[PDB]
Design a protein around this ligand. Structure first.
Ligand SMILES: NCCCC[C@H](N)C(=O)NS(=O)(=O)OC[C@H]1O[C@@H](n2cnc3c(N)ncnc32)[C@H](O)[C@@H]1O
Ligand SMILES: NCCCC[C@H](N)C(=O)NS(=O)(=O)OC[C@H]1O[C@@H](n2cnc3c(N)ncnc32)[C@H](O)[C@@H]1O
Lengths: 504, 502
């Protein structure tokens, strides 16, 4: 049936073209939006019909229900709003044209309506047409009215169908766009300069991740899509721009799940003369201010198991709870780990390997200390973070760009913010010692030769830039898509991306 | 001393500080007041003043170090695009012994923190008289004594930003351009959106794409050449006004107006045509210039600082010209009628004209590419003032709607400012059957050698079959705007890290 509808209607539209009835006209002058139309005329009473007033509106027909031969009702929708078109024969331009236009219209068509405001006897605000014009015909059958567009696959591969039929979808992407606008306002007020840095790199850096590779024909050159803008931003602080930020796309050649898309949006900012303690206060102020400004409360209802699951109230009232990674993991495991100045030994790596096997937490090769630690932290600590929680003082061996902790040997001045069991922020006091930064780069290169696809390349250009003097600096990064996730009560990142990445 | 030996000497000294526990890279320095706020708060003092009442802490980079006998040193402290003098006096320092110790280790380029009192030299220089100077980050290299070489400026942009304050102003202007556009469109009800930068099939422009591969999904992907197709699908979805400031990627050569990655603004407006967008462009571009510059006039130096200067007036209305007629005027010849611009005889006529007028066109010598070369040689070079070039032939606009009076042409315009293309906009083609036919012609051109021809996007065609309302779209090169608002003839001047040959 849907296949035959498409052929029949495609035939009808083609006949209109050759009949000189252009079904795709160039311009239709809209006098008033549907939203402004309702707020301007909702006050009317049943039976009213303002003959004095004539406006032109436009939208998509969601339903067409005829009653007699001289009267048809059209469900006109647009802007997330609805308006009824009460097409009467005696009010139309002519009786012959009234029969002609109604024979041509179908559900799904884009039409323009010129007429008078009115209200039906049943109490529906309506537009009484003098002339209806077909603007763009719909050649397909749209999902039936009883049950419409629930399958996840079609909603994500035809997002325009999702937006036409489900008005909860358009509200999520308004929220997501309100989140980003809030960030810019927050940082612009603080004197940060919004900058743009290359997304194609001779050598990628700024995170531990597998990159996408590409090739430039003219330069006969292999390039990588950026995994993070971190290194370029620190070069800007060397250049004397003490506060920079950038909201931009990152690309990571990794697997898709409920919180990972191969391309995603982050905000990174860098502030001269601040440390990671300063960024804990800024993070609290920004996240809490943003949740309250978007939702309307400092509390967010969160459904980990879908609508028919448990509901958890997440409180974003500062200050957020802080836990030290290694110290709290000793508590969660119920055993003492080697002291932090021993984390580079092989005896320590096999201790953490044994713990992973004993507690069944699982780790694909290479089974590095840093990777085993990350798996243990995810299993025992990150799952307990429902409320916004800072996990602090990461070991140096998992933080190649973070400055060493000023009191705790083996650790760094780093924190991550976790909300509703997922990582939201990553920030630390920046390592500005160029000699120590080279040593950590050369260790990353050995890890890569030892199997880690995510280990960092040696970036000698960046090390040279640090030799010109980077002031004491603290940086910060946040996954915007994950923020939109917990602010729209979405457990699937595909819900907050307009066109998520999909298998063919 | 040699720069290489300077680097070795200073690296050794710094390393000696590290192993002796002297911490040349301290973790945190509490700054009490910014240099800018220090100057406005204390510019009012009089020559000779020295306030014992006030003790603040500032920080910055040493740009100069001139001794005045041994008990007095002057430091030129810079930061935030501003300057402040540090009058290091021996009798005012923490101790005479520490005064000699800190000044002997400090060099030009170092990041330092200064705790002291505000003051003013007898000559009238606002100064801070330090009680204690702290080294925050040493500079291990010799900085240029200026820095005018273009290759070094573009490969070490941090050196450019430290030494040249006209560079820092250009990038402040660029961010003011982007912030202005967002304010302009947000006020008009546009929703800022994000659309995929990795595509199964690239589209929305005529360009050669970058190719990549996703391992887990075992899939070849392309970096986007434009977001146009995704935006129109959102208009089908009922979001009547969308826009996006984002990066585009084009596998082509670098020149004075082309970078392989660049930033554009694209917006799409339901129920508007390209006539509506010409007025929006006038309002936005003129308003943007005046809010940034302060007037509607911008000085333009096509031949560098030592060349002629032209005052470019951005007061609306902008001049409008029709592409084909003005190209016929420049050529001194009549072209075939516009309804013949897709025939092979017309391509052969344009081919002959290109050789006769010595305008080169690398293969394939298609009508669209020969026309593009002719427009670049004869029309686009004469556009100094903001100029609309309108009504492009359909064969150069596979996504633009046909012109309602002139068959063979489209409802399209481009904005040219100071010899550069700035905007591209047209009434969107929303006939799905006609859009498919033009996709099939582009596909044959690709099989005929054009790597820049468009792929057939059946997903987009399917979306057009659900009904795209009459719509007009618009695209602006952000980097190209920053070029003519900073009087830059080289796009590398308005990119923080431009693409360079290795
Ligand atoms: N200078 C301090 C660190 C600054 C940020 C640092 N350069 C960085 O890249 N940190 S990150 O953990 O690798 O990414 C930052 C956030 O992006 C989010 N994100 C990360 N990977 C993905 C993926 N694959 N998909 C979607 N969202 C993601 C996530 O919430 C991170 O907290
Ligand atoms: N729907 C109407 C058309 C919308 C815009 C369309 N998607 C498009 O891509 N137009 S474009 O001509 O191909 O690019 C838009 C602008 O980007 C600028 N630009 C284009 N290519 C480059 C390159 N290589 N480098 C730097 N800047 C560039 C240039 O000013 C263009 O006017």
């Amino acid at each position: 049936d849907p296949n035959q509808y498409y052929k029949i209607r495609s035939q009808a539209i083609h006949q209109l073209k050759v009949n000189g009835e252009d079904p795709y006209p160039h311009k239709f002058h809209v006098d008033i939006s549907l939203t402004d139309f309702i707020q301007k005329y909702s006050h009317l009473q049943p039976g009213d019909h303002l003959t004095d007033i004539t406006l032109k509106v436009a939208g998509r027909i969601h339903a067409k229900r005829a009653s007699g031969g001289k009267l048809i009702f059209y469900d006109l929708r647009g802007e997330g709003v609805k308006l009824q078109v009460m097409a009467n024969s005696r009010n139309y331009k002519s009786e012959e044209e009234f029969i002609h236009i109604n024979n041509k219209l179908r559900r799904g068509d884009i039409i323009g309506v010129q007429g008078n405001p009115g209200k039906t006897k049943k109490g529906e605000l309506s537009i009484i047409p003098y002339e209806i014009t077909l603007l763009s015909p719909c050649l397909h059958m749209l999902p039936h009215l009883h049950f419409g567009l629930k399958d996840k696959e079609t909603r994500y591969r035809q997002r325009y169908l999702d937006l036409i039929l489900n008005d909860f979808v358009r509200q999520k992407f308004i929220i997501r766009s309100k989140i980003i606008t809030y960030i810019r306002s927050f940082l612009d007020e603080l004197g940060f300069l919004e900058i743009e840095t290359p997304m194609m790199n001779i050598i990628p850096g700024g995170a531990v991740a597998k990159p996408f590779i590409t090739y430039h024909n003219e330069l006969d050159m292999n390039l990588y899509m950026r995994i993070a803008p971190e290194l370029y931003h620190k070069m800007l602080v060397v250049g004397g721009i003490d506060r920079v930020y950038e909201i931009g796309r990152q690309f990571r050649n990794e697997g898709i799940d409920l919180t990972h898309n191969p391309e995603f949006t982050t905000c990174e900012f860098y502030m001269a003369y601040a440390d990671y303690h300063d960024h804990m206060e800024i993070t609290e102020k920004m996240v809490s201010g943003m949740v309250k400004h978007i939702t309307g409360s400092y509390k967010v209802t969160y459904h980990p198991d879908g609508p028919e699951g448990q509901a958890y109230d997440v409180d974003f009232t500062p200050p957020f709870r802080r836990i030290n990674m290694v110290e709290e993991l000793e508590k969660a495991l119920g055993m003492k780990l080697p002291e932090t100045n021993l984390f580079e030994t092989e005896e320590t790596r096999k201790i953490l390997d044994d713990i992973c096997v004993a507690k069944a937490v699982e780790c694909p090769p290479p089974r590095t200390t840093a990777r085993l630690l990350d798996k243990l932290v995810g299993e025992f600590l990150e799952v307990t973070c429902i409320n916004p929680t800072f996990i602090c003082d990461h070991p140096q061996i998992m933080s190649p760009l973070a400055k060493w902790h000023r009191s705790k040997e083996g650790l760094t001045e780093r924190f991550e913010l976790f909300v509703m069991k997922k990582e939201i922020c990553n920030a630390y006091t920046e390592l500005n010692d160029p000699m120590r930064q080279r040593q950590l780069f050369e260790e990353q290169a050995k890890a890569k030769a030892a199997g880690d696809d995510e280990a960092m390349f040696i970036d000698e250009n960046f090390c040279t830039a640090l030799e010109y003097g980077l002031p004491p600096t603290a940086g910060w990064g946040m996954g915007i898509d994950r923020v939109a996730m917990f602010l729209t009560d979405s457990n699937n990142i595909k819900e907050v991306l307009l066109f998520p990445a999909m298998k063919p």
